[PDB]
Amino acid sequence: YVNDPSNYQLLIKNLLFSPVAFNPEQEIVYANHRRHSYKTFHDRVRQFANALTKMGVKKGDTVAVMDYDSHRYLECYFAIPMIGAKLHMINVRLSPEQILYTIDHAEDDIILIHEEFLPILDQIKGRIDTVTRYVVLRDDEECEYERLLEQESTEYNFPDFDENTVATTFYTTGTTGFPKGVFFTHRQLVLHTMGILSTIGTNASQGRLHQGDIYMPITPMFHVHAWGLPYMATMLGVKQVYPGKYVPDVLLNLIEQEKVTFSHCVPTILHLLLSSPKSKAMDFSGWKVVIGGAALPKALCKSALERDIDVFAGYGMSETGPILSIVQLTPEQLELDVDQQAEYRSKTGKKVALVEAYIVDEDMNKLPHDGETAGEIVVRAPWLTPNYYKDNKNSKALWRGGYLHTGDVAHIDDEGFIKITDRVKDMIKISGEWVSSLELEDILHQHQSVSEVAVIGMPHNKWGEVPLALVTLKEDAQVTEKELLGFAKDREALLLKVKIVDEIAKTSVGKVDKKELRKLHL
Amino acid sequence: YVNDPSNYQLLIKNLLFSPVAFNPEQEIVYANHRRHSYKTFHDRVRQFANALTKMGVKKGDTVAVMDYDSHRYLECYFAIPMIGAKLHMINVRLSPEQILYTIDHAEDDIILIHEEFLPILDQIKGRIDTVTRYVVLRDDEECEYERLLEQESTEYNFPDFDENTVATTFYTTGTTGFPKGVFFTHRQLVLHTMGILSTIGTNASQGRLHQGDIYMPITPMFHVHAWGLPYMATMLGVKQVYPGKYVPDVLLNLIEQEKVTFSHCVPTILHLLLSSPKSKAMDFSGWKVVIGGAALPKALCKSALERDIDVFAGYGMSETGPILSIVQLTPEQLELDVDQQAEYRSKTGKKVALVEAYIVDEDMNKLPHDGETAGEIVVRAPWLTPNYYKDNKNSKALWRGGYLHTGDVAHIDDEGFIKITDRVKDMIKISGEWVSSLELEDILHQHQSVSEVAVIGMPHNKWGEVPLALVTLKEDAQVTEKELLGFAKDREALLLKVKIVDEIAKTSVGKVDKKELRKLHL
Amino acid sequence: YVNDPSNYQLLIKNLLFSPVAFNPEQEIVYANHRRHSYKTFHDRVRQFANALTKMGVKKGDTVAVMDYDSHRYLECYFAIPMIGAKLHMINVRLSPEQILYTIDHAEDDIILIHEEFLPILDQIKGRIDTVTRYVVLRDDEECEYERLLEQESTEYNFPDFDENTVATTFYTTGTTGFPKGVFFTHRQLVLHTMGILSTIGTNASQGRLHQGDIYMPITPMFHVHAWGLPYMATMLGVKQVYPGKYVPDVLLNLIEQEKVTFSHCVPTILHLLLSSPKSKAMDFSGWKVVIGGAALPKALCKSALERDIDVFAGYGMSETGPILSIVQLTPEQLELDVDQQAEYRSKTGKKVALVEAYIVDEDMNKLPHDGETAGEIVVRAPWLTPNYYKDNKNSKALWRGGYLHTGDVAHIDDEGFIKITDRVKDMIKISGEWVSSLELEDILHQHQSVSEVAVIGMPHNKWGEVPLALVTLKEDAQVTEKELLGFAKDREALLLKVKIVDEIAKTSVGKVDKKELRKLHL
Ligand SMILES: Nc1ncnc2c1ncn2[C@@H]1O[C@H](COP(=O)(O)OP(=O)(O)NP(=O)(O)O)[C@@H](O)[C@H]1O
Ligand SMILES: Nc1ncnc2c1ncn2[C@@H]1O[C@H](COP(=O)(O)OP(=O)(O)NP(=O)(O)O)[C@@H](O)[C@H]1O
Ligand SMILES: Nc1ncnc2c1ncn2[C@@H]1O[C@H](COP(=O)(O)OP(=O)(O)NP(=O)(O)O)[C@@H](O)[C@H]1O
Ligand SMILES: [Mg+2]
Ligand SMILES: [Mg+2]
Ligand SMILES: [Mg+2]
């Protein structure tokens, strides 16, 4: 087969071999374990490509990875798609049965697994069918990955192919069902990297990623491509530090010792870092954390700002690149005091380059951006999944009306800021209105004796759903007093019914399992 | 969206609206039930398109059909792909559990079902999830299909789209596993129609389909697109007769009364037609039957030829268009007596236009075409399925080495004739050689007291498999005598071990279930 | 670059290596010069590919050919596109200045020229810039083509590429302007071959091309791909005879000696063949000539039919494949006497498979097919050129309204027969009506003393054009008598003005130059 050289294909190999800046002596660091350079990283990628080719991996095969944040994961990220194979990212926090389901669904050919998840694989080994090889990863010289890499040469000619070939795949958390498989191509990943770099690098003076930064991930990195940050960092040729296990002390040592300036985490990990005693005598005025898990609270943002940390929220939903929104503050808003700055930073943010992001009601009428009217977000972007893997009913509901349906209810204002209120499946329909469960669950959580609250909604057969607030307490506070306090705030008349429960069911990842609560409590 | 008009897309709507010949007053006949014209057929197709659009069917939806050969099936064949939807063909001869599996796997949106398969649907109705509507078809005016057609107008503007959009899908019989989903696009179907028309219409004087023929199908028509014949006939604008139930008497009346000249069936139906008493006083010297089920025997071919019937074999395997080979006789071979003509007609035939069809061993070395060396057939054609639906392990084994693996062992000769010997999974490996089970099962079936024979193969742990001949008899013939007769023919020394069984297990369609025999008998 | 094997590309190499029928011992014959077999033809094609690769020809280079009908031209037809280069066909009947213009416009890299056109090249050699090599072709062993072929081996691996790569190009005759460059791709040529084979091979009993025919071209073969016949014949594996110079005696010897059954020519050559004395004692009842030049007259058709020749007209216009219409007679019309059969055969014919062919007025309103209303023909087909080479103004006028504008006025009837009346640029607009010049020029040509007549049209500044009939006579017949005879036939009142001229200007090919007549006579 002969192709004309003029036709250019967007490939990940161009992301690695044609960076914005390449520094041969820049360091890739795996926490207290392994330091090497970029000129060693490229040779390592070529060696891994040779080893994969020797192993029988081809243009259609699937390699699954199950480990922590390390140099090996970045090497996989770059080497497996370049061969033409597909990289399946396994969520290690799922239950072993869910992991078995995802492995059978994806039909992986090779499995690279750390030596820490071996007991999990022991339970799920008899019932796995398609895997011809397991490669055990270790933090010492006894690693099979290192043994397989050290036999091959550092020379490899990476092929080019169509830019629409699938590169990566992973599964959703599954709070509402079984996990859903989402996949992306080489083109989509390259475009996402360039679009996000154009959006966040061109900011005037706040929340920008540039070639002088030092990057350390704090998100799982096996979920949403670690927000695409490991790709972007590799394009900038910046120093990269990989922590591994996420122990707050080792993280607060890696920051400081390595002078990390850019990272991204979730509100729980940020709270753990800020509350650790070792952080009380630590300098934080070089750190730019990006919070993208869910619903950055105002108090956490204010405390982080008072610690002189550049904190801003981002919004992505695991099948949209993932990045769709990033908080960017103009220099006029950089004067505002800590309260107003926290208010602006806590929002989901404005849409990134090449994104439509309309707000819509049902039937698709494109509600106005007045700042209080709420509706589902429908988006168009170069890096959206076209459907779900081996699913057609949910794929059909995903792209209804020619737009991707996120399933999140939000209100946009005149300035373009987006504020998510709830999920579509979690809204409470009283008569014809959609009542967000999050707002009144926060109202009830403002009580001193309330530990946690979940609102679901119970059928009335007269007007519709009626909110049901399942509350777990720490002290003795009475059921009637919750209703009295709720009447004292928020109009719900007498429709707020509160039930005291011993525990509130969670999911495997850690989110609240509302479907399980509906199963137990009507 | 704007497309340039110069770019031409191969679509089925071009197959219908730009035929080789269009005759407005040509007849479409449904046996003793409904006669109409082509000028009524086009209006009917447009009415069905309007009804489907009114029903909510869109460019990605799936419509399943479960009925006999009729005008309605042709209307579905043409109207469902033109809308952009996908036509799922349901094999009604499968067991209801297998039908449920295929329905769940395909995720059909609408189901059109005859009133005869309603009891089957009753068993499989609770466990079906994706179907929003069932349309019951009837042979009287009470048909819901006719009621839905008569409400709409005969005007419709059929959209154009990409020629790689999937048009049809169906599942394999499943003699070796569970059924496998295969799909084809608009381009592939159009190319298959044109290629087969070029191959069979240009024959000099034997076995040709031309614009003066009358076409009646005798194959299921819900399996392999009825060999693509209903499309091809519609391109030629020839008279089409649809029998329905396949009763030999009604078939032998439709031939004669309608003067059918071209058809296609399987050896069992042909034997039933030839053995019917009503055929003893019937003229057959205008009929050209195409036999494509499996292994046209020489005796049947000779008797059909003595009845002055133009009989020739065709080879296709349900995921290759299906047509790959057609027997075509040069005018020199038209002189040969009935025995030599039967020998030439019983073969699978030469490859059709735009087909490679190499013979190969294992490891892919492309064995010579000497006429006795046997190997697997590997093909390349414009109309091959790229993979299996929602399957990746079997898809990977399907296209190994860059060629489609049929799984049939055959030998090709210098003239180009192909003769299938067995299936790959049915070959017996004694020491290093592949022994076809079909040849020695025929040898054993030549016995007078043998009713049927199946050869599978039993492990020896010394050289390999050892053939095991499970034989069902009609009379008293002894186990030792089978071995003695086998030694008298065919070198197998003493390796032919014969076991007498009461019955031989079959599959749902009617083929011999060799996997079940291996499960019962070791 | 790696491509998946499932994706199939329509290429000419598949036309050669995957035919409908391949016969190794079938003969390719070059009249009284060279006989070889197909097994020699394939080796010759591979040798030519090796020689072209050795010469520096690449995937974008251009090779021009300037010779007669021979085996070498077929070898070029097949070998040059297979390499990926572009085959430029040079019309040797154009004036040397026009040939220079076309050569400079196309920018040919290599030129293969016969030893007969060498004096023409001598005049046009200084002013040619892009040609790095001339290869002189001869009918003896001193041919440079044979010398270049005999040095290479008969083994070559032909590459595959995109099916939209340009394969052939040539220029129009230029009766209305300068020649216009038209080009076609591999896909278009393959589709044209298959579509025409499906259309003409499936005819019941008249005018069909099958695998038992013997093919000899009588059209230039450097113009419109010789109607695509050399490709189609090669797909059928039929015997091919190439005459060379078109001497009527050698043609009438090649027919008879080689038993040619299928050919195609123009009315002038057919008249010369029928009027030759050697044809008076010749048997013609196996010959099927296809007449596609222009306007097959009824008298010629009747005389050819009385000679027991199967004659039918075809319509194509050098940028539409070219074939768009072929006359096909149903078996009911095969009973009709010679007069009615000649009437039916003289028409342009019905459209071939996959062709729309609407009749339209100006502004595009799609006039009815009543049989007498005339309008321009607008067509859609898989094998139409998308634009003109290096032209954008005429390309824009070519595809106005989303349909290709042929520029011919015709009327279609209820049965689908098309009858061209004139060209759009040749119609005479009296007040608001379009008067065909051909009809009244035939009326005037019915006079005994008229040798030839051309009607152009002279401005009146009152209602519009007024026909002007320039007539060249053989005898003394008077100007007034032409008008009197014209009034005796045909309503033109007194608007038919006739002028006697000594000679009527023709074009380089031989058609009447109406633009030159407008330049000389107002
Ligand atoms: N910045 C944010 N603010 C508020 N909510 C957010 C933010 N980022 C993400 N979310 C929510 O978290 C979700 C992340 O999606 P995902 O990672 O697939 O988990 P999931 O939706 O629970 N998986 P599934 O149960 O299959 O839908 C989004 O759909 C939002 O509902
Ligand atoms: N002319 C023929 N001569 C001999 N065998 C044939 C012929 N035509 C078809 N066959 C056989 O019949 C098969 C038809 O394939 P198909 O309709 O999918 O049934 P199947 O193979 O049993 N389905 P599956 O069990 O999933 O492979 C071919 O694969 C051949 O093995
Ligand atoms: N069967 C036919 N009957 C009548 N006229 C025909 C027939 N076939 C071709 N023609 C005419 O001949 C033309 C052939 O086109 P072509 O070979 O390009 O010559 P041309 O039109 O003179 N070149 P150009 O001057 O650039 O348009 C058609 O456009 C018709 O006008
Ligand atoms: Mg989600
Ligand atoms: Mg099969
Ligand atoms: Mg023209």
Side-chain angles (χ1 to χ4, degrees), chain C residues 382-418:
Chain C
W383 46 80
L384 309 183
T385 196
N387 45 39
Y388 291 113
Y389 191 65
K390 291 179 176 179
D391 204 315
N392 224 14
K393 198 183 99 120
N394 290 334
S395 300
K396 176 190 163 33
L398 180 60
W399 278 90
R400 168 163 66 82
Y403 287 88
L404 192 136
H405 285 275
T406 53
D408 291 289
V409 183
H411 53 280
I412 315 166
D413 54 6
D414 42 18
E415 214 163 336
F417 280 108
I418 314 166

Coordinates of all heavy atoms in Angstrom, one line a residue, chain C residues 382-418:
Chain C
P382 N -22.2 6.9 -11.8 CA -20.9 6.7 -11.0 C -19.7 7.1 -11.7 O -18.6 7.2 -11.1 CB -21.0 5.2 -10.7 CG -22.4 4.8 -10.9 CD -22.9 5.7 -12.0
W383 N -19.7 7.3 -13.0 CA -18.5 7.4 -13.8 C -18.5 8.7 -14.6 O -18.1 8.7 -15.8 CB -18.3 6.3 -14.8 CG -19.6 5.9 -15.5 CD1 -20.1 6.5 -16.6 CD2 -20.5 4.8 -15.2 NE1 -21.3 5.9 -17.0 CE2 -21.5 4.8 -16.1 CE3 -20.5 3.8 -14.2 CZ2 -22.6 3.9 -16.1 CZ3 -21.5 2.9 -14.2 CH2 -22.6 3.0 -15.1
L384 N -18.9 9.8 -14.0 CA -18.8 11.2 -14.6 C -17.6 11.9 -14.1 O -17.3 11.8 -12.9 CB -20.1 11.9 -14.3 CG -21.5 11.3 -14.6 CD1 -22.6 12.2 -14.3 CD2 -21.5 10.8 -16.0
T385 N -17.0 12.7 -15.0 CA -15.9 13.5 -14.6 C -16.4 14.6 -13.7 O -17.5 15.2 -13.8 CB -15.2 14.1 -15.8 OG1 -13.9 14.6 -15.4 CG2 -16.0 15.2 -16.4
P386 N -15.6 15.0 -12.6 CA -16.1 16.0 -11.7 C -16.0 17.4 -12.2 O -16.8 18.3 -11.8 CB -15.3 15.7 -10.4 CG -14.0 15.2 -10.9 CD -14.3 14.4 -12.2
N387 N -15.0 17.7 -13.0 CA -14.8 19.0 -13.6 C -13.8 18.8 -14.8 O -13.5 17.7 -15.2 CB -14.2 19.9 -12.6 CG -13.1 19.3 -11.7 OD1 -12.2 18.6 -12.3 ND2 -13.0 19.6 -10.5
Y388 N -13.4 19.9 -15.4 CA -12.4 19.9 -16.5 C -11.1 20.2 -15.9 O -10.9 20.9 -14.9 CB -12.8 21.0 -17.5 CG -14.0 20.7 -18.3 CD1 -15.2 21.5 -18.2 CD2 -14.0 19.6 -19.2 CE1 -16.3 21.2 -18.9 CE2 -15.2 19.3 -19.9 CZ -16.3 20.1 -19.8 OH -17.4 19.8 -20.5
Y389 N -10.1 19.6 -16.5 CA -8.7 19.7 -16.0 C -8.2 21.2 -16.2 O -8.2 21.7 -17.3 CB -7.8 18.8 -16.8 CG -6.4 18.6 -16.2 CD1 -6.2 18.1 -15.0 CD2 -5.3 19.0 -16.9 CE1 -4.9 18.0 -14.4 CE2 -4.0 18.9 -16.4 CZ -3.8 18.4 -15.2 OH -2.6 18.3 -14.6
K390 N -7.8 21.8 -15.1 CA -7.2 23.2 -15.1 C -8.2 24.2 -15.7 O -7.8 25.1 -16.4 CB -5.9 23.2 -15.9 CG -4.8 22.5 -15.2 CD -3.5 22.6 -16.1 CE -2.3 22.0 -15.4 NZ -1.1 22.1 -16.2
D391 N -9.5 23.9 -15.5 CA -10.6 24.8 -16.0 C -11.6 25.0 -14.9 O -12.0 24.0 -14.2 CB -11.2 24.3 -17.3 CG -11.8 25.4 -18.1 OD1 -12.5 26.3 -17.5 OD2 -11.6 25.4 -19.3
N392 N -12.1 26.2 -14.7 CA -13.0 26.4 -13.6 C -14.2 27.2 -14.0 O -15.2 27.1 -13.4 CB -12.3 27.1 -12.5 CG -12.6 26.6 -11.1 OD1 -13.2 25.5 -11.0 ND2 -12.3 27.3 -10.1
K393 N -14.1 27.9 -15.1 CA -15.3 28.5 -15.6 C -16.2 27.5 -16.3 O -17.4 27.6 -16.2 CB -14.9 29.6 -16.6 CG -16.0 30.6 -16.8 CD -15.6 31.6 -17.8 CE -16.1 31.3 -19.2 NZ -17.0 32.4 -19.7
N394 N -15.7 26.7 -17.1 CA -16.4 25.7 -17.8 C -16.8 24.6 -16.9 O -17.8 24.0 -17.1 CB -15.6 25.2 -19.0 CG -15.4 26.2 -20.0 OD1 -16.2 27.1 -20.2 ND2 -14.3 26.0 -20.8
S395 N -16.0 24.2 -15.9 CA -16.4 23.3 -14.9 C -17.6 23.8 -14.1 O -18.5 23.0 -13.8 CB -15.2 23.0 -14.0 OG -14.1 22.5 -14.7
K396 N -17.6 25.1 -13.8 CA -18.8 25.6 -13.1 C -20.1 25.5 -13.9 O -21.1 25.2 -13.4 CB -18.5 27.0 -12.7 CG -19.7 27.7 -12.0 CD -19.4 29.2 -11.9 CE -20.7 30.0 -11.5 NZ -21.6 29.1 -10.7
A397 N -20.0 25.8 -15.2 CA -21.1 25.6 -16.1 C -21.5 24.2 -16.3 O -22.6 23.9 -16.7 CB -20.9 26.4 -17.4
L398 N -20.6 23.2 -16.2 CA -20.8 21.8 -16.4 C -21.8 21.2 -15.4 O -22.7 20.5 -15.8 CB -19.5 21.1 -16.5 CG -19.6 19.6 -16.7 CD1 -20.2 19.3 -18.1 CD2 -18.2 18.9 -16.6
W399 N -21.6 21.5 -14.2 CA -22.4 20.9 -13.1 C -23.4 21.8 -12.5 O -23.6 21.8 -11.3 CB -21.5 20.3 -12.0 CG -20.9 19.0 -12.3 CD1 -19.7 18.7 -13.0 CD2 -21.5 17.7 -12.0 NE1 -19.5 17.4 -13.1 CE2 -20.6 16.7 -12.5 CE3 -22.6 17.3 -11.3 CZ2 -20.8 15.4 -12.3 CZ3 -22.9 16.0 -11.2 CH2 -22.0 15.0 -11.7
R400 N -24.0 22.7 -13.3 CA -25.0 23.6 -12.8 C -26.2 22.9 -12.3 O -26.8 22.0 -13.0 CB -25.4 24.6 -13.9 CG -26.6 25.5 -13.5 CD -26.6 26.7 -14.4 NE -26.9 26.4 -15.8 CZ -28.1 26.1 -16.3 NH1 -29.2 26.1 -15.6 NH2 -28.2 25.8 -17.6
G401 N -26.7 23.2 -11.1 CA -27.9 22.7 -10.5 C -27.7 21.3 -9.9 O -28.8 20.7 -9.6
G402 N -26.5 20.8 -9.8 CA -26.3 19.5 -9.2 C -26.4 18.3 -10.2 O -26.3 17.2 -9.8
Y403 N -26.5 18.6 -11.5 CA -26.6 17.6 -12.5 C -25.6 17.9 -13.6 O -25.3 19.1 -13.9 CB -28.0 17.4 -13.1 CG -29.0 16.8 -12.3 CD1 -29.7 17.5 -11.4 CD2 -29.2 15.4 -12.3 CE1 -30.6 16.9 -10.5 CE2 -30.1 14.8 -11.5 CZ -30.8 15.5 -10.6 OH -31.7 14.9 -9.8
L404 N -25.0 16.9 -14.3 CA -24.1 17.1 -15.4 C -24.9 17.5 -16.6 O -25.8 16.8 -17.0 CB -23.3 15.9 -15.6 CG -22.1 16.1 -16.6 CD1 -20.8 15.4 -16.0 CD2 -22.4 15.6 -18.0
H405 N -24.5 18.6 -17.2 CA -25.2 19.1 -18.4 C -24.4 18.6 -19.7 O -23.3 19.0 -19.9 CB -25.2 20.7 -18.4 CG -26.2 21.2 -17.4 ND1 -27.5 21.4 -17.8 CD2 -26.1 21.6 -16.1 CE1 -28.2 21.9 -16.7 NE2 -27.3 22.0 -15.7
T406 N -25.1 17.8 -20.4 CA -24.5 17.2 -21.6 C -24.4 18.2 -22.7 O -23.5 18.3 -23.5 CB -25.3 16.0 -22.1 OG1 -26.6 16.3 -22.2 CG2 -25.1 14.8 -21.1
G407 N -25.5 19.1 -22.9 CA -25.5 20.0 -23.9 C -26.2 19.5 -25.2 O -26.1 20.1 -26.3
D408 N -27.0 18.4 -25.1 CA -27.7 17.8 -26.2 C -29.2 17.9 -25.9 O -29.6 17.7 -24.8 CB -27.3 16.3 -26.4 CG -25.9 16.2 -26.9 OD1 -25.7 16.5 -28.1 OD2 -25.0 15.7 -26.2
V409 N -30.0 18.3 -26.9 CA -31.4 18.4 -26.8 C -32.0 17.1 -27.3 O -31.7 16.6 -28.4 CB -31.9 19.6 -27.6 CG1 -33.4 19.8 -27.4 CG2 -31.2 20.9 -27.1
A410 N -32.9 16.5 -26.5 CA -33.6 15.3 -26.9 C -35.0 15.2 -26.4 O -35.3 16.0 -25.5 CB -32.8 14.1 -26.4
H411 N -35.8 14.3 -26.9 CA -37.1 14.0 -26.3 C -37.1 12.5 -26.0 O -36.7 11.7 -26.7 CB -38.2 14.3 -27.3 CG -38.1 13.7 -28.7 ND1 -37.2 14.3 -29.6 CD2 -38.6 12.7 -29.2 CE1 -37.3 13.5 -30.7 NE2 -38.1 12.6 -30.5
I412 N -37.7 12.3 -24.8 CA -37.8 10.9 -24.3 C -39.3 10.6 -24.3 O -40.2 11.5 -24.2 CB -37.3 10.7 -22.8 CG1 -35.9 11.4 -22.7 CG2 -37.2 9.3 -22.5 CD1 -35.4 11.6 -21.3
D413 N -39.6 9.3 -24.5 CA -41.0 8.9 -24.6 C -41.4 8.0 -23.4 O -40.6 7.8 -22.5 CB -41.3 8.2 -25.9 CG -40.4 7.0 -26.1 OD1 -39.6 6.7 -25.2 OD2 -40.5 6.4 -27.2
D414 N -42.6 7.5 -23.4 CA -43.1 6.7 -22.3 C -42.4 5.4 -22.1 O -42.2 4.9 -21.0 CB -44.6 6.3 -22.5 CG -44.9 6.0 -24.0 OD1 -44.0 5.7 -24.7 OD2 -46.1 6.1 -24.3
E415 N -41.9 4.8 -23.2 CA -41.1 3.5 -23.2 C -39.7 3.7 -22.7 O -39.0 2.8 -22.3 CB -41.1 2.8 -24.5 CG -41.1 1.3 -24.4 CD -41.5 0.7 -25.8 OE1 -42.2 1.3 -26.6 OE2 -41.1 -0.5 -26.0
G416 N -39.2 5.0 -22.7 CA -37.9 5.3 -22.2 C -36.8 5.5 -23.3 O -35.7 5.7 -23.0
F417 N -37.2 5.5 -24.6 CA -36.3 5.7 -25.7 C -35.9 7.2 -25.8 O -36.8 8.0 -25.6 CB -36.9 5.2 -27.0 CG -36.7 3.7 -27.1 CD1 -37.8 2.9 -27.1 CD2 -35.5 3.1 -27.4 CE1 -37.7 1.5 -27.2 CE2 -35.4 1.7 -27.6 CZ -36.5 0.9 -27.5
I418 N -34.7 7.5 -26.0 CA -34.2 8.8 -26.1 C -33.8 9.1 -27.6 O -33.2 8.2 -28.2 CB -33.0 9.0 -25.2 CG1 -33.3 8.5 -23.8 CG2 -32.6 10.5 -25.1 CD1 -32.0 8.3 -22.9

